[PDB]
């Protein structure tokens, strides 16, 4: 009875439009002379918010996008549940999140269609959103979902977040090939540059060098030839071994 006169409801959408439904400018200069004369709080309040105001106004990008019905995805691989041996497997759960959703848009979607006291839909809907969010992060809002053992679960969010900040990531040193680590002695017989040399050391290590060398004195075949002979460990080795040295 009346209705004809407007639109009143909820959801982005409506809102969304409210994005649409908007001018900077208006708001802009608005807050402009706002602060220009009135002041404080309010001003400060505005003022500030006038910030972001410009934030857009400025660049040619719309808050519009802030709404959501298209969405991307993790490519495969990324969320892998590769077989844990012993007939076992493990992946990016979360995927679940996806799922879940899938179950939903598929679901309350698949509802649609039918139609009913929405509530229902609302219920999910939001429920979705939520669940999504969860995607974003978990109990960040409310009760964080937690796998059995109430194990809460890794959010979007995470990643370069938490210790595993691919941030943090790099800044950490790590183990790598050919780790000359051992005790030591001087060697009176010394000359700068000079230094110890437990041989069977990179002896062991160096190898790949000659490994291409070697059969250059065609005395192995491939390298498995040599190599495998690296297992043989053969007086010859000590030699051009020398060279590479």
């Amino acid at each position: 009875r009346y209705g004809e006169y407007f639109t009143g409801a909820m959801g982005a959408e409506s809102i969304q439009k409210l994005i649409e439904n908007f001018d900077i400018d208006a708001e802009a200069e608005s807050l402009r002379d706002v602060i220009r004369n009135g002041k404080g709080q309010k001003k400060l309040r505005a003022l500030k918010r006038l910030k972001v105001v410009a934030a857009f106004q400025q660049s040619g990008n719309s808050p519009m996008g802030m709404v959501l019905d298209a969405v991307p995805v993790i490519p495969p691989e990324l969320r892998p549940m590769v077989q844990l041996d012993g007939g076992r497997f493990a992946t990016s759960d979360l995927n679940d999140l996806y799922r879940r959703v899938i179950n939903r848009n598929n679901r309350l979607k698949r509802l649609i269609d039918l139609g009913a006291p929405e509530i229902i839909v609302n219920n999910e809907k939001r429920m979705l959103q939520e669940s999504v969010d969860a995607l974003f992060d978990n109990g960040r809002r409310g009760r964080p979902v937690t796998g059995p053992g109430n194990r809460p679960l890794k959010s979007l969010s995470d990643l370069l977040k938490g210790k595993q900040g691919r941030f943090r990531q790099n800044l950490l040193g790590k183990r790598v090939d050919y780790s000359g680590r051992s005790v030591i002695v001087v060697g009176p017989q010394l000359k700068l540059h000079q230094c110890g040399l437990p041989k069977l050391m990179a002896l062991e290590l160096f190898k790949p060098f000659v490994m291409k060398r070697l059969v250059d004195l065609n005395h192995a075949q491939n390298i498995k030839s040599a190599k495998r002979m690296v297992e043989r460990q053969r007086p010859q080795v000590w030699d051009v071994l020398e060279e590479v040295i």
Partner: protein, 107 residues
């Protein structure tokens, strides 16, 4: 259980020392999309190529070619009316709603 084993993945692992050349010649589809798109779907040197094709747009795409086969194939789901010719006699229905005709036709 701290003690590294190897889980186990899935999927081959070519030594397919790649080149580029000499390969298999191809061909293309480009089918038209609802919107109009032509997600141009190349193909091997030869083969059948569809009439349509579900678009990377998740939608689908009939030929990029004015070929143009058929659309039909759909079919209805159930109606609660269908559930009526189900568990109900029409002329009963017929009336019942007719009775209604009385009712709101009654005031």
């Amino acid at each position: 259980a701290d003690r590294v084993l190897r889980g186990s993945r899935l999927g081959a692992v070519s030594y397919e020392t790649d080149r580029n050349h000499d390969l298999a010649p191809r061909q293309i589809a480009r089918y038209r999309t609802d919107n109009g798109e032509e997600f141009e779907v190349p193909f091997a040197d030869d083969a059948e190529i569809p009439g349509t094709w579900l678009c990377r747009n998740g939608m689908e795409g009939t030929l990029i070619e004015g070929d143009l086969p058929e659309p039909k194939k759909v079919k209805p789901p159930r109606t609660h009316w269908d559930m009526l010719l189900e568990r109900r006699s029409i002329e009963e229905l017929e009336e019942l709603l007719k009775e209604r005709l009385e009712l709101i036709r009654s005031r």
